[PDB]
Amino acid sequence: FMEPYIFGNRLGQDIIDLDQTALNLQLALNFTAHVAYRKGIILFVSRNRQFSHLIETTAQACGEYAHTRYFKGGLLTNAQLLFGPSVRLPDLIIFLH
Amino acid sequence: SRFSLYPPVPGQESSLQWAGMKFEDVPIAHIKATYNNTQIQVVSATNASLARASCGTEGFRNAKKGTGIAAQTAGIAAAAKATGKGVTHIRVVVKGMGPGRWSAIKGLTMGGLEVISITDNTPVPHXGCRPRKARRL
Amino acid sequence: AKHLKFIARTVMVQEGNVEGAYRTLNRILTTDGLTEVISRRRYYEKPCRRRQRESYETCRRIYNMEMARKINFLMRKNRADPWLGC
Amino acid sequence: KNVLKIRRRKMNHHKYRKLVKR
Amino acid sequence: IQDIFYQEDQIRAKFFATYGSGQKAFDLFNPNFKSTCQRFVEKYTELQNLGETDEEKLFVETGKALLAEGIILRRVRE
Amino acid sequence: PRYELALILKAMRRPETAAALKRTIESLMDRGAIVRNLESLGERALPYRISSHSQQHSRGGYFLVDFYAPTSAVENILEHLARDIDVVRPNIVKHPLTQEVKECDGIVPVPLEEKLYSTKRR
Amino acid sequence: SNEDLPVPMENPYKEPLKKCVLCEKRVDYKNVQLLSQFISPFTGCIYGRHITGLCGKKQREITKAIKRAQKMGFMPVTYKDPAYLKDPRVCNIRYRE
Amino acid sequence: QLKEQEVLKLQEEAKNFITRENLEARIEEALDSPKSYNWAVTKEGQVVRN
Amino acid sequence: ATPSLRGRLARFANPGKPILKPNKPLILANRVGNRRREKGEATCITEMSMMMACWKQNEFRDEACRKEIQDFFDCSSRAQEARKMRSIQESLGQSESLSPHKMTKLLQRFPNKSHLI
Amino acid sequence: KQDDEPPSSAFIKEYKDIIPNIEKVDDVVKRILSLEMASRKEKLKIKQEQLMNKIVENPEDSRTLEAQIIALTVRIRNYEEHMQKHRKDKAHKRHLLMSIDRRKKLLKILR
Amino acid sequence: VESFASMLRHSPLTQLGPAKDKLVIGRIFHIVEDDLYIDFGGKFHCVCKRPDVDGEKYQRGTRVRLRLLDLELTSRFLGGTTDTTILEADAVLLGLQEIR
RNA sequence: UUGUUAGGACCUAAACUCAAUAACGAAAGUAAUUCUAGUCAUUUAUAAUACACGACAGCUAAGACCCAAACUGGGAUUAGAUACCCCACUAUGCUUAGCCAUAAACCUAAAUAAUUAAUUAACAAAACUAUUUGCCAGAGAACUACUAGCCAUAGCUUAAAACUCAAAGGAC
Ligand code: FES
Ligand SMILES: [K+]
Ligand SMILES: [Mg+2]
Ligand SMILES: [Mg+2]
Ligand SMILES: [Mg+2]
Ligand SMILES: [Mg+2]
Ligand SMILES: [Mg+2]
Ligand SMILES: [Mg+2]
Ligand SMILES: [Mg+2]
Ligand SMILES: [Mg+2]
Ligand SMILES: [Mg+2]
Ligand SMILES: [Mg+2]
Numbered sequence A: 001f002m003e004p005y006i007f008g009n010r011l012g013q014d015i016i017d018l019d020q021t022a023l024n025l026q027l028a029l030n031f032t033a034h035v036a037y038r039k040g041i042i043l044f045v046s047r048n049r050q051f052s053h054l055i056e057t058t059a060q061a062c063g064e065y066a067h068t069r070y071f072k073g074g075l076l077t078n079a080q081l082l083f084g085p086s087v088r089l090p091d092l093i094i095f096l097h
Numbered sequence B: 001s002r003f004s005l006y007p008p009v010p011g012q013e014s015s016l017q018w019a020g021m022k023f024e025d026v027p028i029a030h031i032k033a034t035y036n037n038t039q040i041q042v043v044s045a046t047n048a049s050l051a052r053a054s055c056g057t058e059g060f061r062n063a064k065k066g067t068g069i070a071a072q073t074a075g076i077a078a079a080a081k082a083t084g085k086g087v088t089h090i091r092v093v094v095k096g097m098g099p100g101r102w103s104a105i106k107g108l109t110m111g112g113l114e115v116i117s118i119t120d121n122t123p124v125p126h127x128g129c130r131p132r133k134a135r136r137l
Numbered sequence C: 001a002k003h004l005k006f007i008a009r010t011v012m013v014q015e016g017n018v019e020g021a022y023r024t025l026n027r028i029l030t031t032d033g034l035t036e037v038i039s040r041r042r043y044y045e046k047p048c049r050r051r052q053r054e055s056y057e058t059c060r061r062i063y064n065m066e067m068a069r070k071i072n073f074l075m076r077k078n079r080a081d082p083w084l085g086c
Numbered sequence D: 001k002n003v004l005k006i007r008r009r010k011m012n013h014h015k016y017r018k019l020v021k022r
Numbered sequence E: 001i002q003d004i005f006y007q008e009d010q011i012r013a014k015f016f017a018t019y020g021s022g023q024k025a026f027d028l029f030n031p032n033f034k035s036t037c038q039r040f041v042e043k044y045t046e047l048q049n050l051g052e053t054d055e056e057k058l059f060v061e062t063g064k065a066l067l068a069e070g071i072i073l074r075r076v077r078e
Numbered sequence F: 001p002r003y004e005l006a007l008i009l010k011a012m013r014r015p016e017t018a019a020a021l022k023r024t025i026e027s028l029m030d031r032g033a034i035v036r037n038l039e040s041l042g043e044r045a046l047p048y049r050i051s052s053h054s055q056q057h058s059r060g061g062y063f064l065v066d067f068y069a070p071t072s073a074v075e076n077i078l079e080h081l082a083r084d085i086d087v088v089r090p091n092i093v094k095h096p097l098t099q100e101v102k103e104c105d106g107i108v109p110v111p112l113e114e115k116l117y118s119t120k121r122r
Numbered sequence G: 001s002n003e004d005l006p007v008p009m010e011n012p013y014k015e016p017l018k019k020c021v022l023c024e025k026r027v028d029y030k031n032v033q034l035l036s037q038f039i040s041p042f043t044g045c046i047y048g049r050h051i052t053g054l055c056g057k058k059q060r061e062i063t064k065a066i067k068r069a070q071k072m073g074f075m076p077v078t079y080k081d082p083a084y085l086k087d088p089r090v091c092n093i094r095y096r097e
Numbered sequence H: 001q002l003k004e005q006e007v008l009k010l011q012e013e014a015k016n017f018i019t020r021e022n023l024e025a026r027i028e029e030a031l032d033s034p035k036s037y038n039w040a041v042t043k044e045g046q047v048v049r050n
Numbered sequence I: 001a002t003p004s005l006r007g008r009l010a011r012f013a014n015p016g017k018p019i020l021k022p023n024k025p026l027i028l029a030n031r032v033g034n035r036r037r038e039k040g041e042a043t044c045i046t047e048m049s050m051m052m053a054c055w056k057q058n059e060f061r062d063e064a065c066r067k068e069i070q071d072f073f074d075c076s077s078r079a080q081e082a083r084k085m086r087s088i089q090e091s092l093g094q095s096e097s098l099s100p101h102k103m104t105k106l107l108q109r110f111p112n113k114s115h116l117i
Numbered sequence J: 001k002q003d004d005e006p007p008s009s010a011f012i013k014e015y016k017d018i019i020p021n022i023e024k025v026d027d028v029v030k031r032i033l034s035l036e037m038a039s040r041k042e043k044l045k046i047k048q049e050q051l052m053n054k055i056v057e058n059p060e061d062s063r064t065l066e067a068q069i070i071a072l073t074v075r076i077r078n079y080e081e082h083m084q085k086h087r088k089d090k091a092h093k094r095h096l097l098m099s100i101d102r103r104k105k106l107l108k109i110l111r
Numbered sequence K: 001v002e003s004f005a006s007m008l009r010h011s012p013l014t015q016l017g018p019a020k021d022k023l024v025i026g027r028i029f030h031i032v033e034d035d036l037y038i039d040f041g042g043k044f045h046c047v048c049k050r051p052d053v054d055g056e057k058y059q060r061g062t063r064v065r066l067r068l069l070d071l072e073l074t075s076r077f078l079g080g081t082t083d084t085t086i087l088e089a090d091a092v093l094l095g096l097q098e099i100r
Numbered sequence L: 001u002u003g004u005u006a007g008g009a010c011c012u013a014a015a016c017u018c019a020a021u022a023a024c025g026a027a028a029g030u031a032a033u034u035c036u037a038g039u040c041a042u043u044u045a046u047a048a049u050a051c052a053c054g055a056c057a058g059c060u061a062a063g064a065c066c067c068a069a070a071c072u073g074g075g076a077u078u079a080g081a082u083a084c085c086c087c088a089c090u091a092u093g094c095u096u097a098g099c100c101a102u103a104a105a106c107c108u109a110a111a112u113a114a115u116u117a118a119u120u121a122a123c124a125a126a127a128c129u130a131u132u133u134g135c136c137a138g139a140g141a142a143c144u145a146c147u148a149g150c151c152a153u154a155g156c157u158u159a160a161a162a163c164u165c166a167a168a169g170g171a172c
């Protein structure tokens, strides 16, 4: 399902078309801004441990939330039990990984 | 300038002599190690019998006849007869793959004979006779 | 029987290490496959049984050999954790 | 699969062979 | 998926087979780095614009031009 | 066709070896053959003891005879040479040069096989 | 359209195929020196292609030549001739530890 | 062209084929000069004639 | 080089009869088998025989074989420390290679997937 | 038997038209390239070509039904000679009976 | 504005050609005990061992010389549907780069 | 009797390594060497009441016989042991003709031409379209009864019903 976005294969290494990336990135950043404008909750999510501290530092800088640790089964499908009766779930999740 | 595992080549000139004897002359120790009895015969390089022994002749019987210690005793007995006849160096051709295959060579060493080489002549047919049927257990 | 004696399957004893000569002789016969042949020639293996055994051993060799590659392929990534604490 | 259906035929054929023998 | 092969690769392949990689080390952090091989391909192109049609002529002439430039090209068969 | 004879002869003195090679090649001609070349490989020790004509042999002279003959003559030649008393072992094969060293471009790397099992989780 | 788009072509850098030590050479039954390089010094047994390193075609040529040579009074069967014990080693195998 | 050349080569080669007239002389020339088909290869695939 | 697995199994691609009939699917697991225990060999077996040999001649009197009895203790005393020192250090270190448990956990960090993600 | 059997002095089909052009060739060279020093397969390539000339309008074409039938008549008579010596060869007895049936199928389409 | 197609054609990585047995300059960004994590300008870093000679010289930020082998270490195994990747590159550390 | 024999004879039987190979053949099957003979073009699928083949075992006549080995005899085990284990030995495995025509003869997947998205009953070796023939229609009774054909005579192919049950069966 990634072949649409791949510019080609440079000696075994797939190259990603940066023209499609620019178009898609424009839409994604545009959506992320309107969500932030309307005071929605944004959660950054990644499991790469090399970038765990950077992604948690970014969320703190933005003013949003980060979950870079082991994800508990039911965090979103069972939020009321895990967090409390009136817990407000994220309005947008950004998956850096 | 290193030792050669490969034996001397018959019909050539070599510097290897044991007790003033060439390789072709050193007497041969024929060990037939079967799964029941281990026999040993020592012969001169002209194929003349010098010593003979086996677990049976030593006096072992039934399942004891096919142990490691039984062959070791048989080798020591074969050495004594050969040592009396005038044998100090032996070429060990070990036929068979039984329990006293190694023990018989160890007994010969304990008995005062000096092994210079070890050959193997276990019969390996190249396609031959149908073996007996597999035992069910 | 028609060949020359004391050339085949013969090892020479080096400085009285008779055990080493025997251990080398056995390593040769095992490496050359003679040991397994004499082991399996004591009784008769039926043609269907022989084919089933060779299919089994080839599939095992394929699995074991490939399993070693993955083990060696990932041997380098087994190092101290660079990102301890995160 | 099991050999149960073959066992029924195994007994039917064995018993028939002994009946023909008698 | 299209295999990415530019026309310079024909020239670059010959350069690596004849001289290997330039003894100078590649610096992939400099966005405008010019390697020994990339200068060979720039000169080989210039001669080809003049109208030389023989690949053998363009390869030995380019080697001479870089020798005048002072680049150390070793024709390492090893 | 073109056949290469491999004639191991009894170890003898050159006078008798030459007489044996004249008697042998003459038989090939008598069977409708066209001898192309005769080569010697030297006297040597046989790889094992070959028993021919009630004599055990440990040394023999190796010779090659290249020739042409009908397909029907191959059998007659081998029968005659086996009756000669100075021939340890005659072996006729098709001449190797007729077969050609095939052209190769190295071993092709065939990758590990795939799509042997379905992509169903286990 | 675009001059810098990649051009379809066969891989310029494609590596050459490795050849066996007997590629494009004549295996003859009378060349007992070469045949002896692929048997065991002690038992005279033919080595497998995981030891000789030969391809399928040349492995079968050596096999067919050793058997023809052994059967025609050129080569011994139960060992390697002592003359060829000093020849180059082209087989991956070590009897000594 | 190929078949004409192949026929011509065989005609040239037939000059040196053995016949009843030259049998004894050709036998002695062979006996005087033995031939060897032996040669060995290295791990690099290089012939090593001795 | 791993043996060839092309044209071996019975499949709709393969025109001829199958070569291999695996008992189980040929898919690398993400674990390694538990290595079956290995035992040692008798230590000081030669020195015990020497001691016993002297007794037989001297009617099992320790007066004659005093020296041999001290050699038997010497070999046992060395082996006693050797088994103690090697179990404490070598076994604990596991420096040379990974164990089945350590290996499987590494094989699970980069597991083999026979199913699409 | 059949009216025509190639003579032993005839050249093989590769050099059938090449030796005549060559000005002078030795007797030995002619004997090496004759049908006496060739396999039976070569003698059958000459038998077929003779029949194609005597029957087919265009002997250059070997894909016609008439030519295919001629190719199978040589094989059928070849398999029959084989089976006269090898009386218990069941693979060639199958080859003989299958070629006969193939000819009948081709003769039907030709008719 | 330069197009992506132009950027890729003139990119240092496109000029490198095959990465086997090539020489490149890397930078140490992370060190864990005697393991050096080196960025050589590719997608994945490599991990080498601190050389015995001039061990103290190899500190963070030190530019070094390398011989690339693979840009990513990957391999499909028996029964796998995809290549297993360890998210790491392969290179041989040759030594420090002369600042000159 | 046994061991050794670089002693003699025999040429019975079977083909180590190569083979971690995967070729040939319609299937059955086929791998010691050499030589002779030899596989090949019908567009393709589709055939019986015809023709030709068909592992192993078995039958007929004459030979072979190293080894193996139903049966049989002897030894042991057991409560018994018409077995599993030990020893001896025959039919038989081999050759020359003829017969028999059966296998879990199953790679349990007919052959041919595609397709890999619009596509998980389970398991096995992913799904699925078209063409043509064959075959199947709850289980048991039944590789049976009767009929016809066959070198087959305690045989093979062909193949029911009465009667019984409310299940049998496959995968998990
Ligand atoms: S790789 Fe070319 S013949 Fe072996
Ligand atoms: K089956
Ligand atoms: Mg089961
Ligand atoms: Mg019943
Ligand atoms: Mg199963
Ligand atoms: Mg005897
Ligand atoms: Mg004898
Ligand atoms: Mg032929
Ligand atoms: Mg009884
Ligand atoms: Mg009998
Ligand atoms: Mg019979
Ligand atoms: Mg049936």
Ligand SMILES: [Mg+2]
Pocket: L105
């Ligand atoms: Mg079958």
Ligand SMILES: [Mg+2]
Pocket: L143
């Ligand atoms: Mg039946």
Ligand SMILES: [Mg+2]
Pocket: none
């Ligand atoms: Mg019936």
Ligand SMILES: [Mg+2]
Pocket: none
């Ligand atoms: Mg009936």
